[PDB]
Design a protein around this ligand. Sequence first.
Ligand SMILES: *[C@@H]1O[C@H](CO[C@@H]2O[C@@H](C)[C@@H](O)[C@@H](O)[C@@H]2O)[C@@H](O[C@@H]2O[C@H](CO)[C@@H](O[C@H]3O[C@H](CO)[C@@H](O)[C@H](O)[C@@H]3O)[C@H](O)[C@H]2NC(C)=O)[C@H](O)[C@H]1NC(C)=O
Ligand SMILES: CC(C)CCC[C@@H](C)[C@H]1CC[C@H]2[C@@H]3CC=C4C[C@@H](O)CC[C@]4(C)[C@H]3CC[C@]12C
Ligand SMILES: *[C@@H]1O[C@H](CO)[C@@H](O)[C@H](O)[C@H]1NC(C)=O
Length: 154
Amino acid sequence: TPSMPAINTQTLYLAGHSSKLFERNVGCVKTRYLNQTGDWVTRSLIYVFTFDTEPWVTQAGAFQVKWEPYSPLLRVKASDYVRDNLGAKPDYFIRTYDNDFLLLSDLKEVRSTCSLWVTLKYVDRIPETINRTFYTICPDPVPVPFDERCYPGG
Ligand SMILES: *[C@@H]1O[C@H](CO[C@@H]2O[C@@H](C)[C@@H](O)[C@@H](O)[C@@H]2O)[C@@H](O[C@@H]2O[C@H](CO)[C@@H](O[C@H]3O[C@H](CO)[C@@H](O)[C@H](O)[C@@H]3O)[C@H](O)[C@H]2NC(C)=O)[C@H](O)[C@H]1NC(C)=O
Ligand SMILES: CC(C)CCC[C@@H](C)[C@H]1CC[C@H]2[C@@H]3CC=C4C[C@@H](O)CC[C@]4(C)[C@H]3CC[C@]12C
Ligand SMILES: *[C@@H]1O[C@H](CO)[C@@H](O)[C@H](O)[C@H]1NC(C)=O
């Protein structure tokens, strides 16, 4: 079966989210794998804050994730900074996933907010099936448009 992306070693990019989650001046949102200790994977949360900040500066946070096989929950132990400023929760509902995408939902909201994550394979072109699922399940879906500037080099 496909490998669960959250505990895998490929970088994940935020491709879509519910409007309510929206943070003004936050762009290029992605997560890189750092290491693993026991059942916990450590990843970074990378982004750019575009207001009154130099254009080459990347903001960075860190968090840990745990996924028991076939669990519908992703466990998240986010840093104090990430919990305080980016609203990270201790658990997320896993709607679906494949080798190169992950769709997460909030646990405690009745009108559950969502986030769609993809690997490099789909950053310039989200497959129609994933896009359709995202627009079906997610309240107030906001796509994150492709931007060349959010990547190393160009
Ligand atoms: C990802 O999906 C988006 C959502 O698609 C819409 O919802 C799905 C669940 C399904 O019902 C699908 O058929 C719907 O289109 C896509 O966005 C939609 O794209 C439409 C076409 O570009 C757009 O439409 C408008 O334009 C036509 C032009 O003739 C008008 O007739 C029509 O009335 C609309 O004004 C539609 O508005 C738009 N929806 C939203 C909410 O953005 C999106 O393109 C797709 N992306 C990929 C990569 O496949
Ligand atoms: C990808 C996996 C492995 C876990 C990620 C967990 C945490 C860090 C994720 C899950 C949902 C994410 C949020 C989803 C949507 C937005 C809106 C955007 O405007 C700014 C980033 C922000 C606010 C994200 C910040 C990081 C976030 C809180
Ligand atoms: C994993 O990364 C974190 C974050 O930088 C670090 O604190 C930790 O020492 C690293 N090593 C291991 C094996 O946990």
